[model samples]
Target: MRPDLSRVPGVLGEIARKRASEVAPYPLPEPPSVPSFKEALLRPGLSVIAEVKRQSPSEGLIREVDPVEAALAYARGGARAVSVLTEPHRFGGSLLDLKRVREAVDLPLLRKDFVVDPFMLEEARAFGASAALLIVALLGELTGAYLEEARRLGLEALVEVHTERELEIALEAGAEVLGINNRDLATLHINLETAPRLGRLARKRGFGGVLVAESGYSRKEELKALEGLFDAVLIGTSLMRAPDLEAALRELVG
Candidate 1:
């Protein structure tokens, strides 16, 4: 979901400077032995990467949650990976939420945020994230550099692309894991067909690694139809809004 980014650009650097001073110096600790995110998606069936988000621009207040508890519920419900929304303002999440969730779950952790700079990735590492969301639209000519840095940081970059051009850039940047976000960054409009359209484009452009179909997914038949098309699905709003988390997950994952 799109957070108002006009005020967010400079705020990133501001937050970066403050955070750099707060965190321990680099030469970070070894990566954890959490299950591989890619392996989880490629496990012979369509995998579900459940998300923990408190709110969104499009959906407004979705749920109030303790990140750790929500994550544990997702893991127990068979979520292949757990995406923790870390954008503080619009998403109602923070890095502290991610840190606490990291402590509570062995499932792969994806630090979900706008991610316009290197500090976000560093923060992801310091807080024990297994992966980070890199919106392709946010990184233009520097896509390759950001991907390189993500690799250097040993964080799986969920390089997100919503268009053909962005997809080309992500592929050229050698993004190991690519996400097809159906939501438009500008209008926040979602088109479910965005996933398969981009998925076909990737198949033609030669991307074979795990591909994630993001946004606007809520039906079992929809996911079942997408079985071979998408390796994984990152679903947040519908799952979080479900009356019963366990039942919703079973319906989606089964």
Candidate 2:
């Protein structure tokens, strides 16, 4: 589902540069820790991993609020976890935001980025992220290594995939938590059926990990239909756009 690989040619190199810059100022920390993300997602019912992003490639600037402030409201609203986009350029986010949110809130922070290196994992751990997103599409051969690296750092890794084939790749990388993205990377077209279809694939393959539904949903009304198929939801746009962040998050979780 990594559509528009060409649309984002600068993405791979951009992240590479950011990665070096991140570690340049500070040497890698020893014994990086994991947050409460695993516990949060496994909590009784459908968990909401609320997202805080300033902008996206598709939609320009979504919000201008500080990531910490947004995370605070989401946490108070009973969000299980908070996802902060760290993709500097297109997403207008940085690991600094993750670091700030970690200090401001007790909820586990997720470093949402296009992770391509282990140094990025170290960055997530250093920034106080409980978890990091690993897109299976872009990271073909490196998936397993990234997963292993995350575990070594005691960090939770949410392996995201658009198709069952990608799921197989994630599993090969030893991904315990899988994210089913409904939005196709190429067309940005969302298919609600995507989650269920992949969920069924996990069933057939005897998957033992948690399932997360990602993208294309803005209304809480959709969650009623999405429950069971996915154990959790990672939402960014709608949560960022809602007039009342706290209230909108409440609706998303309930």
Candidate 3:
């Protein structure tokens, strides 16, 4: 059964509802374990979590590339983890991408989608994803319950937040890996300072877990500035638009 989407608004809620109505639980056997999405980001310098998405609601028709090839390029470019967008309607992504990318790269695969149901988490694990995206704005009070379900399934949750209140909710939910998003899902605006501001607050409140800066990051200098503030950065559009995916990733993480 789908949870109430009354709390979620705008296009975000629309997509989430559609996904909830269509997604079904996978009855496959237990899948093999993969690398830890959190450990990959905890290494020495700032780590990069490269993404594979053909398009997005903000930037439509980003690139026409194979998911497997794109993931391999990210791994070759020294990305710690790979985020595979699995939303099919607007992003032009499919669960097949997550499965294929898992087969193509040794790095952990994050099933990036508007997760509204626990069944999606089961689908993620069955499709070979090591982790899944859990947006605080989308999950609201259900965030904690979803996190526990993911933990029980042996899947990591990259709890995403765009504001201080959201960050507080995520931290209260005992989120181990937090992703501060720069792009506001409601207005689709990019504010690069969002992550650092909230990240600092998270640390000040004694959040010693992994902190990931998500969205609106492209330049190496931009990422460098986030070095001490965030443990990792999740970049998608820029890398997807690049002519050479591997080289683009190398330059961004350098």
Best by lDDT: 3
TM-score of each: 0.87, 0.88, 0.97
lDDT score, residue 151, model 3? 92
Q: Which stretches of candidate 1 lie over 4 Å from their true place?
A: 1-34
lDDT tens digits, residue span 1-254, model 1: 22223432343434433433444445645555554666777877888999988886677757666667778888888898999988766677887888888889898888998775577777687667878988777666577888788778777778899889999999999987899998876667889899999998898888988899998888898888778777899988888888777678888877
lDDT of each residue in 1-254, candidate 3, tens digit only: 34678767777878888888897765776768778999999998999999899887887658578889989999999899999999999888998888888888899999999998888888888778889999999888779999999999999999999988999999999999999999988778889999999999999999999999999877998888898879999998889999999999988877
Superposition TM-score, candidate 2 onto the true structure: 0.88
Per-residue lDDT of candidate 2, residues 1-254 (tens digit): 11223323344545544544554435765644545687788887788998899886655557567788889999899888899898876688877888788878888877898875567777788768888988877676668877888888888888989887898888777778889988775556778789878877886787877888888678877888867767788888887888889999887776
Best by TM-score: 3
User: With candidate 3 superimposed using the best TM-score fit, by how many Å does residue 50's alpha carbon deviate from the native?
Assistant: 0.2
Clash pairs (backbone) in predicted model 3: none
Residue 35 in candidate 1, Cα distance off native in Å: 3.8
Better of 2 and 3 by lDDT: 3
